[PDB]
Amino acid sequence: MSFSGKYQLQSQENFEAFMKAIGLPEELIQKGKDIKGVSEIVQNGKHFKFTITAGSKVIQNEFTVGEECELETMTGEKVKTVVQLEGDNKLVTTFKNIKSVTELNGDIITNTMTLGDIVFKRISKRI
């Protein structure tokens, strides 16, 4: 099953709480909290390219699952980690104490990022 596609954010929970917890300037939080942009995934086998719209920032990540890679953070910083496949439809990874799980079901992607007790959840639909 392939993740490839262009996805528009439908809804999200805890954007503000999550962004505050990672130290985003309140100014970038209010500007970005209501943006419903488009995220793109290009999948080639175990190689993924992500162009993500997160609030008012565009985040870019390329990686091969199982290999070491660098993920870009909201704050601009790069972090070493590894992204795994769990089943055919779940990408799982951890960085800066954040547990992320990105799951595809048909045309719906559910991105769940957990930091402390904050569950930041984003739901996007293929366009």
Which residues contribute to the site for ligand WII (CB under 6 A)?
7, 9, 39, 41, 50, 52, 54, 59, 61, 71, 73-74, 83, 91, 93, 100, 102, 109, 111, 122, 124
Residue nearest to ligand WII (CB): 39
Cβ pair 26, 33 in contact under 8 A: no
- What is the nearest approach in angstroms of ligand WII to the Cβ of residue 104? 9
- What is the nearest approach in angstroms of ligand WII to the Cβ of residue 53? 6
First to last CA, the chain: 17
Sheet holding 98-105, edge to edge: 57-64, 47-54, 38-44, 5-13, 118-126, 108-115, 98-105, 90-95, 84-85
**For residue 116, what are its two tokens?**
């402390």
- What is the nearest approach in angstroms of ligand WII to the Cβ of residue 120? 7
- Selection from 116, 124, 125, 126 nearest residue 17 by Cα: 116
Based on C-alpha coordinates, what's the Rg of the chain? 14
- What is the nearest approach in angstroms of ligand WII to the Cβ of residue 79? 10
